[PDB]
Amino acid sequence: PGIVELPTLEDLKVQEVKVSSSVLKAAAHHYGAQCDKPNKEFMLCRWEEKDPRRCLEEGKLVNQCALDFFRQIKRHCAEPFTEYWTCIDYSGLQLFRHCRKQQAKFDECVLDKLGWVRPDLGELSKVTKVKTDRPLPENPYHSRARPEPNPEAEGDLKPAKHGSRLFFWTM
Amino acid sequence: MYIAFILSTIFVIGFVGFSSKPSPIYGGLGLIVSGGVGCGIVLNFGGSFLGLMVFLIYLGGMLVVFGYTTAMATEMYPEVWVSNKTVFGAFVSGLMMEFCMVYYALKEEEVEIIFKFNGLGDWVIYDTGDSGFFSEEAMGIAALYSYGTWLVIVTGWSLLIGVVVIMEITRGN
Amino acid sequence: NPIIYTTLIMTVMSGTMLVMISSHWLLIWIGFEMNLLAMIPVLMKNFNPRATEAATKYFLTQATASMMLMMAIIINLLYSGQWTITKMFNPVAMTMMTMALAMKLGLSPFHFWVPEVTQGISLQAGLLLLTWQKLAPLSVLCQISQSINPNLMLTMAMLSILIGGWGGLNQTQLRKIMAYSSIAHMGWMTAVLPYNTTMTILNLLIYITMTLAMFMLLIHSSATTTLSLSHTWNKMPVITSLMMVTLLSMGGLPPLSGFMPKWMIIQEMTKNESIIMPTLMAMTALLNLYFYMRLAYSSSLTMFPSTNNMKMKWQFEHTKQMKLLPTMIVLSTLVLPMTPALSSLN
Amino acid sequence: KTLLHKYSDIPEGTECHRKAYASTSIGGATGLIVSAYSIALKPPASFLEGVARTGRYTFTSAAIGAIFGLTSCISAQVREKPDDPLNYFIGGCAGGLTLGARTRSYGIGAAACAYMGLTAALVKMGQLEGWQVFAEPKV
Amino acid sequence: PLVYMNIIMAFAIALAGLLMYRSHLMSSLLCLEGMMLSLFIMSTLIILNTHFTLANMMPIILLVFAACEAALGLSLLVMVSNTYGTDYVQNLNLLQC
Amino acid sequence: PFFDVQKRLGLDLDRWMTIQSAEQPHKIPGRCHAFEKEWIECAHGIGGIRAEKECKIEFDDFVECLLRQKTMKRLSAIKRQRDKLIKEGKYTPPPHHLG
Amino acid sequence: IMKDVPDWKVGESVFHTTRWVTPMMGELYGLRTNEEILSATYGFIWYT
Amino acid sequence: MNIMLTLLTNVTLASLLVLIAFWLPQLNAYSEKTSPYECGFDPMGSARLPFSMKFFLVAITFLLFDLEIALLLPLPWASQTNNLKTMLTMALFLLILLAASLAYEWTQKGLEWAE
Amino acid sequence: MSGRPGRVPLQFLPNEARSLPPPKLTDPRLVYMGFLGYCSGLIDNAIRRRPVVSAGLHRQLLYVTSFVFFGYYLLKRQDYMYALRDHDMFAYVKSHPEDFPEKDKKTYGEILEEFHPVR
Amino acid sequence: AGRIASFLKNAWAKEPVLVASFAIGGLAIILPSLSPYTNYAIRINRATPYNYPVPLRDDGNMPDVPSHPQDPQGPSLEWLKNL
């Protein structure tokens, strides 16, 4: 009963960030701090548009911005990442607790080699705003014009004409 | 897919286990196993809490019904599914009852009996959503004490009335 | 112990009130058990083999109806996804519910339970069963009256009136005929239910008040058979006088208040072009009128032989106060001239 | 309910064979229901008498439907008056006579003839006009 | 889907089993008890399918009262088994009149 | 309710469950939050009988989202005819659809 | 695949509305292989 | 399906044990060995007569209590909600309700063996 | 009725029912309901075998006062339902002219109503 | 005074477990009113994020919410960090 639209196979292909989950979560705290503007832009699109097909451009931006993030850490101290992410791998729950020494070695590269600080607790879990310039979707749910409500009763109450008007009851 | 439909098929003839009047705990055998596989049906759809609950309190509930059968509802010759001819007729009539439609469903997938439903298995009906870090079933159940409130009160108060009711009816002056 | 018997009576009232104030399909069922849970104890309060007889018979049919009532809700959940008390969105499920609720009310051949249970249990519990559980299913029927199948409910109503009043002139126990008479009155209120819900409430209230006034009179007379009621003329002839006045009231002859529903029910049905159906139920209501007079014949209008020990009963007096009896009698006989009050219910 | 439509579609008189056969279907169906209620409320004993009771009821009910169906169409064909209510009366009265023959007692058949005869004219009464028994809630 | 068909016909034979007494009430009472197992499984199937978080409520709460119905049920059967001795529904007719 | 005691004192007793798009434990969405939302606020204050013909499209789509039967029937037609001709020949699976 | 069927719009709107819907996973894995079906559809629950 | 594999293996391994314990270790039955045991003598003849309980009262209360505990199993997850205030009162309310029912039965005899 | 907009459930005589004229204390319907109080008074002493006309007048006075009290509000609600039924009714015909046309009422000079001779 | 002391003596003498179970059951009900950490327990559950707090479009005049998860403004949890 209509048309479905899907972006063609070309514009949905990006330089996908191909690295394992443990590495991502090992650097997630630093990744979420600075590499956030494309991320915050991406799901303001996801929640406002409520349609993934309308947010491929932001998906490209976050994918490539994460790639620059991974380019920076690989270039400055690749080795300290190695022991930190492999001990995260060894943890079945990927627990941060059995990583403090390895986390420490990672932390002091990016703080001094590149200037990246470690966010504290409750830092990334915020409602922070983002400065997207795109127009606001007028009808995210694509709702139609709604039926007009039935007219509202108005006026004043007058006595019942000729009483109850039931059979032979005068009033 | 097998298991999802196969387990429900065992749930069916398991229900024939007690709906055909065997000796009462042979019927107890009938629905305890379907209760076992009934845990599986909800299990495949997630439903671990609810699946374990029926495998917790049915066995608790079914624990005493055996006692009442062997104490105050058993006969000199206990029944079985083959001894009495009517119950065997009841057993078999519960075997071709679903056998025709599962063959009808497996061959046509458009069986119309009462309700209209297609027969492309049931793996399709699942979802693509992500639960994040919270199980939907285990948290909806946990909403008993946050949003149940009145729904909690009527259940708890009735359980009190339960122990009054099960006492006075059996007291006998 | 009387203190607890107040609680289970309260819970039966509380469960019934729960049904009539709930907007969730689940809670409506919950009230039915709250009624069902605490009913059996008060049904076998005397603890007789007949009491255990009736209690078991009551439980089996009532549990079946309530259990049938869920997947009537559940199929609605399957095809609507709504728990709110509104019209039903799947037909086969709601047809399933109509049988379930008729089982609770005792309209269809489902009606077999109500005359059986009423005899085994005492008069006081008979009144409560016959005057209080006829509200909770009524509330649900009142709510779902939008999409109600006309042929389904009318067929159920006709049978309840027919068999309800046809076997009435075959029972020598008063508790039996009232259960038989109630099924006939059950049909009258359920017949109008698809068309207009307001007159159902009025017929419910009129039937309820007469149900107290008679059962309440029966407790005072302490009668179990028609001959037992016949002996009442030698102690309290006035009590036996209100006996017959209520019978003709339950018959439906004006100015008595029993003509309230029969006059009001056929009105909108004729407005709704249903005319053959009103004629048949009215004519077969004479079957109700028959055994009504026969009980009146044996009780009030003619004398009956008494016993020697009956004289000593004159010396002593009744001790039960039997609250609210006079108001029910007047509210069951002299009410017709106040007809427009159906708007207050409306 | 399909049987009711299977009888009403056939115009009065013409296709009397199908009209008679349709009337048997309603008669046979109604006999099945009353027989099914009969051996459930009152259990005879074994299967032999149970099937006999159903056989007696189904044969009787189908007999009333069969003769009533065929009498209505032949009367309409012979008299050439399809709208006449008495086209059902003589079929309706014949229903009582057949019931009297089936019950081996013409005493109850005589009164049955008038009763089913009056109703048969009454169902033709409503079919001709706009009479309806199960009215929808128009108001 | 086909899983739904299997478990609503579970009701049907349970419905047939409940209102078909052959010898004793205990078998029918168990059938009434097991009747809710389909009712439990039925209601549970939509609720996880539809992801309606709150209404996971009722499968457990249906279990509160359905088994409570059984609880007063087999306790009623106690009163029968003292006056009646057995639990036969055929004998369960002392109110013939 | 017969007596809407819920609305009188204004305190909820059972309305929290009722409909699907009510508030959820830390906002877990339902399957048909969008479709059920569109139908519910379509027929609000309009009347039960004055809701079927007008707010229909928002309803069958919602009951479609609940059951998804016509789409499963659509998948049935796809799968049935797929097994019809691949067994006969013609179609050969592309290498991503079978591994 | 849709050439033999008499009437078939290729990729017609599943619903009467044009708003996007979460994809019913039967559309997703309908014509995939059996192992890919069990790996994700029944994957989590059957996984230990 | 890992749980299925161990379940299948477990019931299989049990079945071999009964299988070779019924065929391998000889077979010789001559009726009185096959007869039931009554501490040396012949039974009165039954094992099917009503063995009426003397604790029937407590059995049903177990069903009510074993049922109601299923109402408080969600407690570990019920603690981690944003509304522990009404959670505390409602969860407490259940435990007093079981306590009251146990107290009610206790006082009106009940738990002690019915004679 | 059970679904009119702007309705408060379980709410008796509302804030606009007072706009109607109150029933008079000499309302024939009201005094009859007071007579029911008088009737319910005398019968009470009949069950308790008391002087049906000269027993405790406190019961009879209380029997009449209760009936005359609850009746007055019911008689107030009486008209309000009918007035509300009449009020909305006249709004519908005004708001739906096409369903209620006005025929050009013509005198009997033009009406051809045929004559039936009876003899 | 005398009656309760003797009653406590009698209960502690006959069934110590019941007079015990009434004690732990007794104060576990009234401690919540006296609990000073219940408010912290309220704040414990609120702080724990399950759904990720989707950002808000800033049309101006929301100084409280920051533009980045590094600015001081916004809800914070150093009470937990101390705890």
- The residues spanned by each domain of chain B are 3-171
- In terms of Cβ atoms closer than 10 Å to its own Cβ (0-12, 13-18, 19+), residue G22 is middle
Backbone φ and ψ for B166, nearest 5 degrees, come out as: -65, -5
Please, what is the angle between helix A78-90 and helix A100-109, to 10°? 160
Two tokens at B148? 């149940």
**Does F2 contact C143 at a Cβ distance shorter than 8 Å?**
yes
Could you give the residue ranges of the DSSP H alpha helices within D2-139?
2-8, 16-41, 47-79, 86-102, 106-128
Distance, CA of H62 to CA of H110 (rounded, Å):
12
**Does E49 contact F31 at a Cβ distance shorter than 8 Å?**
yes
Would you call the peptide bond into C255 cis, given omega within 30 degrees of 0 as the criterion?
A: yes
Residues on chain C touching I49 (C-beta within 8 angstroms): 236, 238, 317
**Does C56 contact E69 at a Cβ distance shorter than 8 Å?**
no
Classified as helix, coil or strand, C266 is helix
DSSP string covering C23-50, please?
Answer: -BHHHHHHHHHHHHHHHHHHHTSS--HH
HSE-CB for B38 with a 13 A CA cutoff: 33
Closest CA to C330 of I58, I29, I42: I42
Q: Is there a contact between B9 and E11 (Cβ–Cβ < 8 Å)? A: no
**Does C343 contact I82 at a Cβ distance shorter than 8 Å?**
yes
Regarding chains A and F, contact by 3 or more CB pairs under 8 A is answered as yes
Q: List the Cα angle A23/A25/A27 in 5-degree steps.
A: 70
Residues on chain G touching H5 (C-beta within 8 angstroms): none
HSE-CB for J69 with a 13 A CA cutoff: 26
Residues on chain C touching A164 (C-beta within 8 angstroms): 340, 343
Total domains in chain I come to 1
Backbone φ and ψ for C24, nearest 5 degrees, come out as: -95, 135
Residues 6+ apart with CB under 8 A from C54: C43, C44, C116, C117, C118, C119, C120, C121, E95
Two tokens at F68? 């998804």
- Stretch (H or E) spanning C313: helix C310-315
Q: List the Cα angle J52/J56/J62 in 5-degree steps.
A: 125
Two tokens at I113? 């109503």
Place of tokens 């009656």: J3
Distance, CA of F36 to CA of F40 (rounded, Å):
6
Distance, CA of C231 to CA of C344 (rounded, Å):
42
**Does I33 contact C338 at a Cβ distance shorter than 8 Å?**
yes
Out of A6, A52, A142, closest to residue G19 by CB: A142
Backbone φ and ψ for C214, nearest 5 degrees, come out as: -80, -55
Distance, CA of J5 to CA of A4 (rounded, Å):
82
Closest CA to C299 of C245, C341, C249: C245
DSSP string covering chain I, please?
Answer: -TT-SS--TT--S-TTGGGSPPPPTT-HHHHHHHHHHHHHHHHHHHHTT--TTTS-HHHHHHHHHHHHHHHHHHHHHHHHHHHHHHHHHHHHHHH-GGGS-------TTT--PPP----
Distance, CA of I42 to CA of F11 (rounded, Å):
46
DSSP state of C147: S
Two tokens at A82? 């190695």
- In terms of Cβ atoms closer than 10 Å to its own Cβ (0-12, 13-18, 19+), residue J82 is exposed
Q: How far is CA C297 from the centre of its chain?
A: 23
Q: How far is CA I56 from the centre of its chain?
A: 33
Classified as helix, coil or strand, C225 is strand
Distance, CA of A158 to CA of C144 (rounded, Å):
33
Classified as helix, coil or strand, G43 is helix
Two tokens at C119? 């005899």
Q: Is there a contact between C21 and F5 (Cβ–Cβ < 8 Å)? A: yes
Closest CA to E48 of F21, B3, B137, B35: B137
Distance, CA of I108 to CA of H81 (rounded, Å):
82
DSSP string covering I1-19, please?
Answer: -TT-SS--TT--S-TTGGG
Query: Residue H51 domain-assigned?
Result: yes
- In terms of Cβ atoms closer than 10 Å to its own Cβ (0-12, 13-18, 19+), residue B35 is buried
Residue B110: Cβ within 10 Å count:
13
Distance, CA of A96 to CA of A116 (rounded, Å):
19
Q: Is H109 left (phi over 0), alpha (psi -120 to 50) or beta?
A: left
Residues on chain F touching G32 (C-beta within 8 angstroms): 97-98
Task: Note the resolution in Å, 1 decimal.
Answer: 3.8
Q: Is there a contact between C79 and E8 (Cβ–Cβ < 8 Å)? A: no
Two tokens at B113? 């009996």
Best H81, H85, H87 residue to mutate vs chain J (most J CBs within 10 Å)? H85
Query: Residue H115 domain-assigned?
Result: no
How near does any CA of chain B get to the CA of E19, in Å?
A: 10
Q: Is H81 left (phi over 0), alpha (psi -120 to 50) or beta?
A: beta
Residues on chain I touching A156 (C-beta within 8 angstroms): 19
How near does any CA of chain I get to the CA of F10, in Å?
A: 11
User: Residue H14 maps to which CATH number?
Assistant: 1.20.58.1610
Closest CA to E28 of C110, H64, C60: C60
**Does H86 contact B146 at a Cβ distance shorter than 8 Å?**
yes
Interface check for B46 against chain G (CB to CB < 8 A): the answer is yes
**Does A3 contact G11 at a Cβ distance shorter than 8 Å?**
yes
Gyration radius of chain A's alpha carbons: 30
Q: Is there a contact between F32 and F19 (Cβ–Cβ < 8 Å)? A: no
Interface check for F89 against chain A (CB to CB < 8 A): the answer is no
DSSP string covering C281-301, please?
Answer: HHHHHHHHHHHHHHHHIIIII
Q: Which domain holds residue I91?
A: 1-96
Residue of D nearest to C271 (CA): D139
Total domains in chain H come to 1
Two tokens at G46? 């059957």
Residues from J contacting A (CB-CB < 8 Å) are 47, 49, 52-58, 62, 65-71, 74-77, 80-81
Backbone φ and ψ for B17, nearest 5 degrees, come out as: -60, -45
Query: Residue I112 domain-assigned?
Result: no
Residue of F nearest to C27 (CA): F14
Residues on chain A touching C339 (C-beta within 8 angstroms): 166-167, 169
Distance, CA of C63 to CA of C51 (rounded, Å):
18
Q: Is there a contact between H79 and H87 (Cβ–Cβ < 8 Å)? A: yes
Cα distances (angstroms) measured from residue D104 to each of A132, B121, C128, D97, D109: 96, 60, 49, 10, 9
Cα distances (angstroms) measured from residue I4 to each of A6, A153, C218, I18, I28: 47, 9, 43, 19, 31
Best A128, A130, A132 residue to mutate vs chain J (most J CBs within 10 Å)? A128
**Distance from first CA to last CA of chain I, Å, rounded?**
53
Residue F94: Cβ within 10 Å count:
8
Classified as helix, coil or strand, F26 is helix
**Does A159 contact I4 at a Cβ distance shorter than 8 Å?**
no
Chains that touch A (3 or more CB pairs under 8 A): C, F, G, I, J
Two tokens at A132? 């997207």
Q: Which domain holds residue H31?
A: 1-108
Distance, CA of C335 to CA of C263 (rounded, Å):
13
Q: Is there a contact between C23 and F4 (Cβ–Cβ < 8 Å)? A: yes
Q: Is there a contact between C175 and C118 (Cβ–Cβ < 8 Å)? A: yes
Out of G14, G15, G20, closest to residue A51 by CB: G20
Please, what is the angle between helix C197-221 and helix C325-333, to 10°? 130
Out of J32, J38, J45, closest to residue H82 by CB: J45
Best C29, C39, C47 residue to mutate vs chain B (most B CBs within 10 Å)? C47
Distance, CA of B70 to CA of H47 (rounded, Å):
10
Residues 6+ apart with CB under 8 A from A129: J55, J56, J57, J58, J62, J65, J66, J67
Place of tokens 């204004």: F10
HSE-CB for D63 with a 13 A CA cutoff: 16
Out of B155, B165, B172, closest to residue C38 by CB: B165
DSSP string covering A13-61, please?
Answer: --------HHHHHHSHHHHHHHTTHHHHHHHHHHHHH--GGG-HHHHHH
Distance, CA of C89 to CA of C86 (rounded, Å):
9
Residues on chain F touching E51 (C-beta within 8 angstroms): 28-31
Query: Residue I10 domain-assigned?
Result: yes
Residues on chain E touching C120 (C-beta within 8 angstroms): 95
Two tokens at F47? 């009347």
Interface subset of I 17-36, CB within 8 angstroms of C:
29, 32-33, 36
**Does C271 contact D134 at a Cβ distance shorter than 8 Å?**
no
Interface check for C151 against chain D (CB to CB < 8 A): the answer is yes
Place of tokens 């044009």: G18
Residues 6+ apart with CB under 8 A from B4: B41, B44, B121, B122, B123, E3, G42
How near does any CA of chain H get to the CA of G46, in Å?
A: 5
Q: Is there a contact between F15 and F40 (Cβ–Cβ < 8 Å)? A: no
Q: Which amino acid is present at D104?
A: R
**Does F25 contact B146 at a Cβ distance shorter than 8 Å?**
yes
Classified as helix, coil or strand, B74 is coil
DSSP state of C309: T
Cα distances (angstroms) measured from residue C181 to each of C169, C175, C241, C248: 10, 10, 20, 13
Two tokens at B74? 């058993």
User: Domains in chain E, ordered, with CATH?
Assistant: 2-91 (1.10.287.3510)
Cα distances (angstroms) measured from residue D31 to each of C61, D36, D58, D99: 27, 8, 4, 13
Distance, CA of E47 to CA of H98 (rounded, Å):
29
Residues 6+ apart with CB under 8 A from B88: B81, B82
Residue of E nearest to C119 (CA): E95
Best A156, A158, A162 residue to mutate vs chain I (most I CBs within 10 Å)? A158
CATH of B3-171, one of 1.10.3720.10, 1.10.287.3510, 1.20.120.1200, 3.40.50.1240: 1.20.120.1200
Out of G16, G26, G31, closest to residue F61 by CB: G16
Q: Is there a contact between I66 and C331 (Cβ–Cβ < 8 Å)? A: no
- In terms of Cβ atoms closer than 10 Å to its own Cβ (0-12, 13-18, 19+), residue A9 is exposed
Cα distances (angstroms) measured from residue B118 to each of C17, E12, E48, F67, J41: 42, 20, 19, 10, 50
Cα distances (angstroms) measured from residue A170 to each of B145, C24, C161, C337, J77: 58, 43, 34, 12, 76
Interface subset of F 3-62, CB within 8 angstroms of B:
13-14, 16-17, 25-26, 28-29, 31
**Does H84 contact J42 at a Cβ distance shorter than 8 Å?**
yes
**Does B126 contact G25 at a Cβ distance shorter than 8 Å?**
yes
Best E9, E11, E25, E33 residue to mutate vs chain C (most C CBs within 10 Å)? E11
Residue B107: Cβ within 10 Å count:
10
**Does F7 contact I9 at a Cβ distance shorter than 8 Å?**
yes
Closest CA to I63 of I41, I92, I35: I41
Backbone φ and ψ for H38, nearest 5 degrees, come out as: -135, 50
DSSP state of A112: I
Two tokens at F74? 């659509």
Place of tokens 């039924």: I85
Residues 6+ apart with CB under 8 A from E10: B11, B12, B15, B34, E37, E38, E41
Residues 6+ apart with CB under 8 A from I29: C338, I23, I71, I75, I78
How near does any CA of chain C get to the CA of F54, in Å?
A: 16
Experimental approach was cryo-EM
